[PDB]
Design a protein around this ligand. Structure first.
Ligand SMILES: O=C(Nc1nccs1)[C@@H](c1ncn2c1CCC2)N1Cc2c(cc(C#Cc3ccc(CN4CCC(CO)CC4)cc3)cc2C(F)(F)F)C1=O
Length: 272
């Protein structure tokens, strides 16, 4: 739809959820003016976003973030402009998928893991169709609406260990560098939220990658799943899968989960 211009009296902050590079995120409640319905919302308030030039840049960008319309992409619902900038979306009450997998890894099954892979590829496919490059896809930027329903967020306008080699060496970002980060995102899921390249400093990653090293095979992953991941991390960006292809391939596996991921016995052995 469109970006609603919200009045500060329309919504209240309830709790601080976090704070990042951009600002502070709060849980809140939004009662649309006129309406009787009360919508739980997440509200991000930017730090020092007060310059005229950035104010216009932010508004222009916000219009585009409010224009996405897909079940697996978070949409910006509105903005509130006062002394500060506040960005409002619907609250995803289960929080981010990275945290969710770390919390629930003792009970997460193969059907859920592979469906999350499908859903993220579907929302990434939609952004590709909208000509929107993500630049920071990671399990921490996938939110959980319900255990069965995830949505991508914080896309649009340095996470070295998620970044395609070209992005690291040349600052090139395209849909194909998004495909690489997708591969790393999937690895995070299949490892139940392990940290990629753990203990290796960021400063070394381009070298390791140039030498041709890559994240290892997650123990529950069958070879065909690991192949998809390996394919996302080829040097030649045009050799990597396309999001449309990833939808098909993971959809096929989701039809037969137990064939493609094996989650059995000693879960201490499910870690890379
Ligand atoms: O809203 C967001 N997350 C939320 N989570 C919960 C509630 S809202 C995410 C988000 N990205 C995609 N989507 C969402 C929500 C739904 C889809 N966003 C959109 C978003 C964010 C940031 C800014 C910003 C900023 C900014 C720019 C310049 C300076 C000052 N200076 C500083 C120094 C600099 C020199 O480096 C020059 C510029 C300051 C700030 C803008 C927007 C957008 F697109 F709305 F206009 C951001 O994070």
């Amino acid at each position: 739809a469109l970006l609603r211009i919200l009045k500060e009296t329309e919504f209240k902050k309830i709790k601080v959820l976090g704070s990042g590079a951009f600002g502070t995120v709060y849980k809140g409640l939004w009662i649309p003016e006129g309406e009787k319905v009360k919508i739980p919302v997440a509200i991000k308030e930017l730090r020092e976003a007060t310059s005229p030039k950035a104010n216009k840049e932010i508004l222009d960008e916000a219009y585009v973030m409010a224009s996405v319309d897909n079940p697996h992409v978070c949409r910006l619902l509105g903005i509130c402009l006062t002394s500060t900038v506040q960005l409002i979306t619907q609250l995803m009450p289960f929080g981010c998928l990275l945290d969710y997998v770390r919390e629930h890894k003792d009970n997460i099954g193969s059907q859920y893991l592979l469906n999350w892979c499908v859903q993220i590829a579907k929302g990434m496919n939609y952004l590709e169709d909208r000509r929107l490059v993500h630049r920071d896809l990671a399990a921490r930027n996938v939110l959980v609406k319900t255990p069965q329903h995830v949505k991508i967020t914080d896309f649009g306008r340095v996470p070295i260990k998620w970044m395609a080699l070209e992005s690291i060496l040349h600052r090139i970002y395209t849909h194909q560098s998004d495909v690489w980060s997708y591969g790393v995102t999937v690895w995070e899921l299949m490892t139940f939220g392990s940290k990629p390249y753990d203990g290796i400093p960021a400063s070394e990653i381009s070298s390791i990658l140039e030498k041709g090293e890559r994240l290892p095979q997650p123990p529950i992953c069958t070879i065909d799943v690991y192949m998809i991941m390996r394919k996302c991390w080829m040097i030649d960006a045009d050799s990597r899968p396309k999001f449309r292809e990833l939808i098909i391939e993971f959809s096929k596996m989701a039809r037969d989960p137990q064939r493609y991921l094996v989650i059995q016995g000693d879960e201490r052995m499910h870690l890379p």
